[PDB]
């Protein structure tokens, strides 16, 4: 009586297709650009290194 | 007679993978790619 | 009669190992790396 | 009855190819760029 | 982290 889906076994399935599929392919902006946004963290680490032409103001002159 | 996981009683729910336009997305149209840096002249100009 | 990974109800499983695609990015195509760094210049103006 | 795959001894084996050797092959985009912005280590230790 | 451009401004001169 219960009744309901079975997966009898264990291989590749697929099942309640679509909607989540689709949108995905659509946009996904939010995490899209979330994501994307995040990763300046190259950029942001090369900032934190390049730092080092700190070098020459080494020569402080506090009088 | 049965093996799995029968579930029932209201609403939503959902059990396998249904990755139909996830694997679309992985597999990228390279033209798709392409589009998206060509059109980023736009978003610099909002930045300039 | 019987010996392995015997394995059943519902889902997803993996037991192999089947790297077809990552054998091939292994064997990656010299002509696909040149392509690579030729495009750069793209990725520069973005910078510049 | 419970049925399954087996692989018995032991030597080379493929079973459920393609899948994640295609989507390697194909990009893999996230961590490739990531261990590619993590090898700027280089330029950092010679800034250092 | 594009603060990092105050490299240049570490040569206080505080006499």
Known sequence: ESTGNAKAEAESRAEAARIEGEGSVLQAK???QALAIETEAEL???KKVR????IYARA????
Request: charged share 45%; no cysteine.
């Open 51 to 54: 730092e080092m032409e700190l």
């Open 60 to 63: 402080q002159l506090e009088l």
């Open 44 to 46: 942001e680490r090369v």
């Open 30 to 32: 939010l995490k899209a």
